[PDB]
Amino acid sequence: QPNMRTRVCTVINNNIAHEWTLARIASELLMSPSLLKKKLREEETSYSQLLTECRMQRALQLIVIHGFSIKRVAVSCGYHSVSYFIYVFRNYYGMTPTEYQERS
Structure with missing residues (x-):
């Protein structure tokens, strides 16, 4: 159910x-x-x-893999626009994909 x-x-x-x-x-x-x-x-x-939400959840899994550019992550999550993807990730996580990629 x-x-x-x-x-x-x-x-x-x-x-x-x-x-x-x-x-x-x-x-x-x-x-x-x-x-x-x-x-x-x-x-x-x-x-x-x-x-x-599904796309942000998938973005966490891809951002950590070596040499996968922010650009690559966005396309793999179904975004055609990296600026927009960055905007929605920052809203969801409090930081840019690049910031996140640098903590990990």
Whole structure:
């Protein structure tokens, strides 16, 4: 009995870089987009929040590998824009990907 946010994170983590939208996650779950939006909202989240969170979680795993540039990490997490990826990582972790890469 996994709740709805868990099932969505499971879909997303199967292919993190994928262009996930509400409809595409919903089709995987055999649900209407409207129902999926509804169930996620009852748990105070959206597909896009869950997407981001999944992507930040994956970013931690890749940033530590030798010579994987910040640029490479972003692309592997599905970001087309390194500035934007940096912005969302800094919001999520309190520091830039570069800072994080230098502590580890």
